[PDB]
Amino acid sequence: SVNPTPNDYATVVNECCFAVYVLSSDDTDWQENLRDWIRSAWDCSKPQCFGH
Amino acid sequence: EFSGEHGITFEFVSLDISTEGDVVYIEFRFRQNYEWCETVREADTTIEAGRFSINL
Numbered sequence: 001s002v003n004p005t006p007n008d009y010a011t012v013v014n015e016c017c018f019a020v021y022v023l024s025s026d027d028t029d030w031q032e033n034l035r036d037w038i039r040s041a042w043d044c045s046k047p048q049c050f051g052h
Numbered sequence: 053e054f055s056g057e058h059g060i061t062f063e064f065v066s067l068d069i070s071t072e073g074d075v076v077y078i079e080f081r082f083r084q085n086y087e088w089c090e091t092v093r094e095a096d097t098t099i100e101a102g103r104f105s106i107n108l
Binding site: 044 | 106
């Protein structure tokens, strides 16, 4: 019930693109944020790197 | 000499002469081959670059 997860940090991690991601935290919010970031990377936007 | 100067050659076909009173008509008939060039030679429709892509 503490789980300090807040993380909208597309600044620290940016264009330098990573293939695999692993998030060691069962908090739904953190997972969903990572999801959003990946799906943003996976969008029709011409610069692509295709992360998972 | 002209052909040597510019690279243009003609074909000879026939020679006829004929007089009348005090004049002689000397009639050559030449024939010249060539290819006609499209002149429009204009600017292109666009310049390509960036396309688009949806590999749904």
